[PDB]
Ligand binder design. Structure first.
Ligand SMILES: NC(=O)C[C@H](N)C(=O)O
Ligand SMILES: NC(=O)C[C@H](N)C(=O)O
Lengths: 351, 369
C-alpha cells in the first residue's frame, strides 16, 4: 500500500542516484493527514528525540532550581555545530550544576559543520566531551541525576533513574506502551529510541499545540507548559539548536516562531507547526507535525525533500521559503563552474 | 518473510543500531563473461548507469589509440594515472606535471578544475596550509593530460579538447560504445565533475568493459597474436595492476584491492558509488562457469560509497574470488566500523541480497528492479 516515493538526482537528465522518502504529516492528536512512503516505518529518532529528552530533564524534581534559561534549554534540544559559543554555553551550564567536563559521559567527534571542522583541523584541535553535539542534553541529564540525588557517574546507563524517566517520557509523548519503543545506543553513548515515524511527527505536533495553548492562556497541564517552554526556547534560540548555516537554524529563523524543526542523524527530520492559515487549509483545526526519513540516510536529500514538502503543504510564504533555496535545490556545479544536473521530486503526497 | 519468494527488488545492504534498522540501500550488480553474457546478478543488472570514473580505462584506450601518442613515451605509471581517480597526493601532482612536460604543455592548458582531495589525509594537509587546489590537482588530471596529448598528436588544437565536438571526444564516444558493443544511441552523455563528457549505459556493459580488459591481459600473457585494440587493453590492465597507487592512492579501496590481488584483477571506482572489476581467468572464474575472464559491475542506487565498498567486498567473497587471506586486507571495508564517541560498537552492516544465476521454482519471476 505505501507508495513508491523517491527524490531523484540527475546529471544532464540521466538518473544518478535515487532515494526513498518516508514522511508523516499528523494533527495534534497524531491522526495521519498526509504521507509519503511508509508513514509508520520503524525509525530511530536519534537527535530528533531531543525535545522529548529535554522534557524528561525539565520534569525532574529540583531541576528548576538550577536556573537554566531559554538558550540553555535550546542547547538541551540541540545537535549543535560545536561552535565556540556552543562550547561556552555547555561550560556555563556545567557551572550552574557545579559539575565539570569530566562528569560528561558523551565523547567528542568531528564537527557537524564542515567549516568548523576545517578550522579545527587547521589548529590540530582534538574535540573532547564538551564539544559533543549532544553536550547540552548530557548536561541536562547530569543535572537531573544530581537534582534527585542519584549518582552522576552512570546517568547515561539504561538502569539509571534518569534514563528510566527518559524512556517513560518518550513512550508517553508517542502514546505508545513501553514495549512498542525499541532502544539502541546513540553516538553520544545514551540510550536512543526507535518508534513508528508518524509518532515522531506526533511529538512535534504536541510541541506546537502546547505553544498554541500557552499563547491562548489556558488551564494548561504542567506538561503542556513545559512542552510550550521547549518550543519557545528552540524558536527563540535556533542558533543554539544547530549553528550558523545549518538547516534547522535557517529554517526556524525564516519562520520566526511559526514552527520548530530538528534534525535526526542518518537523515530523519521533524517539524512542529503552530496553527495557522496553512494548517487550517490542510484540514486541521490545530497544530501539525511533520516527520521525514530518507531510507538510505542522505542528509542533502533530506533537506531538499523537507523544503519541497513545506512548499507542497503551503507552509510559509514563497518569500519565507526562498531563504532555504540552497537546500531545496542543492547546487550541482562542477570544478569548472558548469551546472551538471539537478534534483527532482517525482513523489506525490497522498491525503 | 518467505525465502521462496525473494526478488531482485529485495537486494539490500542494511546498517543497524542494536539490531534496529538504521539505513537501507538498494544494490545492483552484474557479473559477465568476456563476451558480456550475464552470469550472475543483483537487483537490475542492466540499470542505465553513469559510469563516471569507472569509464576511465575506456577513455585511456581512446587516448592510447590516438595516432602519434605513442611517441610521447608515456610509461606504465603514466597510463595508470590516465586510468586514475587519484588522491591528489604529491606524487600524483608530480606525475601530472611530468606528463605535461612530455607533451610540452602547461597546467594552464588543463580544462579540469581543482577540488577537495579524495583522501581525507591529503585534504587535512591542504586545510592546514589554506591551500586552494588547482587544475593540476584534479583526480582526473592524468586523463586530461592524455586527452591533451591526443589532441596535440593529431593536430587538432588543444583549447577545447574537452568539448563534445572535438575529435578527441568523438573518439572517446565511439570507443565507449564499441567496448560496450552498443549503438551510439544506446549510450547517453552528460558532463562530469572534471568537465568532460561522461557516459551512461546499462550496468552490465560496464562489467563487459572490464571483462574485456582482463581478457586482453590473458591473451597477452599467453602470447597470442592480438589486434592493436586488444594489445592496448592488455597494456591498460597491466598498468593499473602494476601501479595501483597511481589509480587511487594510499588507503584507498582500489589501491588496496589491486595490491591484495597482485595482478589477478583490476578494479576501479566511479563517483556516486559505482564499481567495476575485471578478473583474469582462474580456478575461481572456472568454478563460476566461464572458460575465460570475468567482469563485475556494481551500483548502489542512492550513491553511498561506504556501502559500495562493503558490498563489492561481500560480492567477491560470494563469488569465491580471492583467498580469505587476500580479501582480509579489505576487512575494514567489508564490515565498516560502527564505534561511537565513547568507543562502544553500536551496530553493523548486513547483506540481505541474494545472488541469482546458479535453483528456484520456475514460477518465481526475477523482475530486474
Ligand atoms: N544529531 C544526532 O542525532 C546525534 C545523535 N543523538 C548521536 O549521538 O549520535
Ligand atoms: N571518481 C569519479 O567518477 C570522478 C569523475 N570522473 C569526476 O569528474 O570527478
Amino acid at each position: 500500500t505505501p507508495s513508491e516515493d523517491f527524490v531523484v538526482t540527475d546529471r544532464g537528465g540521466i538518473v544518478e542516484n535515487s532515494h526513498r522518502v518516508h514522511a508523516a504529516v499528523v494533527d495534534a492528536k497524531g491522526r495521519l493527514l498526509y504521507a509519503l512512503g511508509n508513514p509508520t516505518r520503524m525509525t530511530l529518532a536519534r537527535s530528533a528525540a531531543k525535545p522529548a529528552q529535554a522534557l524528561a530533564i525539565l520534569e525532574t524534581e529540583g531541576v528548576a532550581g538550577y536556573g537554566f534559561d531559554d538558550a540553555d534549554i535550546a542547547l538541551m534540544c540541540a545537535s549543535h555545530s560545536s561552535e565556540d559559543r556552543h562550547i561556552a554555553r555547555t561550560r556555563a551550564m556545567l557551572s550552574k550544576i557545579k559539575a565539570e567536563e569530566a562528569d560528561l559521559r558523551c565523547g567528542g567527534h568531528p564537527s557537524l559543520s564542515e567549516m568548523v571542522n576545517r578550522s579545527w583541523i587547521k589548529q590540530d584541535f582534538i574535540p573532547t566531551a564538551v564539544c559533543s553535539n549532544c553536550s547540552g542534553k548530557h548536561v541536562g541529564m547530569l543535572a537531573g541525576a544530581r537534582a534527585i540525588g542519584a549518582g552522576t557517574d552512570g546517568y547515561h546507563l539504561p538502569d539509571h533513574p534518569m534514563q528510566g524517566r527518559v524512556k517513560r517520557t518518550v513512550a508517553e509523548l508517542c502514546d505508545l506502551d513501553a514495549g512498542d519503543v525499541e532502544w539502541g545506543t546513540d553516538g553520544c553513548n545514551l540510550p536512543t529510541p526507535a518508534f513508528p515515524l508518524d509518532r515522531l511527527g506526533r511529538i512535534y505536533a504536541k510541541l506546537a499545540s502546547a505553544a498554541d495553548g500557552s499563547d491562548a492562556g489556558e488551564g494548561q497541564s504542567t506538561r503542556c507548559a513545559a512542552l510550550a517552554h521547549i518550543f519557545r526556547a528552540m524558536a527563540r534560540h535556533p542558533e543554539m539548536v544547530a549553528g550558523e548555516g545549518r538547516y534547522c537554524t535557517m529554517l526556524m529563523r525564516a519562520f520566526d516562531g511559526a514552527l520548530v524543526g530538528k534534525l535526526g542523524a542518518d537523515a530523519s527530520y521533524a517539524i512542529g507547526v503552530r496553527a495557522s492559515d496553512a494548517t487550517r487549509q490542510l484540514g486541521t483545526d490545530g497544530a501539525l507535525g511533520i516527520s521525514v526519513k530518507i531510507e538510505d540516510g542522505n542528509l542533502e536529500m533530506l533537506y531538499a525533500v523537507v523544503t519541497e514538502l513545506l512548499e507542497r503543504l503551503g507552509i510559509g510564504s514563497p518569500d519565507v521559503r526562498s531563504q532555504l533555496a540552497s537546500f531545496h535545490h542543492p547546487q550541482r556545479v562542477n570544478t569548472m563552474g558548469v551546472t551538471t544536473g539537478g534534483v527532482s521530486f517525482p513523489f506525490k503526497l497522498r491525503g
